[model samples]
Target: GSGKGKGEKCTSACRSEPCQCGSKCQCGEGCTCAACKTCNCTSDGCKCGKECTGPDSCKCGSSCSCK
Candidate 1:
């Protein structure tokens, strides 16, 4: 659609931010912007990641207390 400018790797946070097509060359934080990329468990939260919140936040990683 006519929403995001021209970004190439804008995922979820990408949808919220405006990485546009400039990428690291123009983006302020550039790759750093990935910091917002938490969770990564397609089955749970964003969905899974060692950084994911508690168990409900993301049921993955050994740190997860939700066994």
Candidate 2:
């Protein structure tokens, strides 16, 4: 815990720029926008490779999962 940085808990709201997709942001473990996604993981996978679904089927629109 002592080695953890203060920014370790970063969240999607911390994004420098709002995501193009209106869907919710799934910030990666690092909590950086670069690793943020517009979808939520449905299953576990390496490096967040798990299957993901849009916050809502209707909200998914035509864009691919931001993961």
Candidate 3:
């Protein structure tokens, strides 16, 4: 009930991010959402950068050519 101090502030490294994952927030190791390719695969699709095959190429299919 009295877990606060007179000069208390959020300066902890662990508090840098919340416990959110998919619906609420997105990131970190436990994150699992749709737009998580940036931190999810990040190494697949033959190359890096913002490319179709580098991320979610399923939505573009033929329209998104890698070359």
Best by lDDT: 2
Model 2 per-residue lDDT tens digits across residues 1-67: 5433314444445444554324554333443233243455443432233333333221222234443
RMSD of 3: 13.9
**How much is 41 displaced in model 1, in angstroms?**
24
Q: What is the lDDT of residue 34 in candidate 3?
A: 29
TM-score of each: 0.17, 0.20, 0.18
Candidate 2 worst ten-residue window by lDDT: 53-62
Best by TM-score: 2
Between candidates 1 and 2, name the one with more favorable TM-score: 2
Better of 2 and 3 by lDDT: 2
Cα lDDT for residue 60, model 3? 23
The sequence of per-residue lDDT tens digits that candidate 1 reaches over residues 39-65 is: 334444443334444333332323333
**Candidate ranking (TM-score, best to worst):** 2, 3, 1
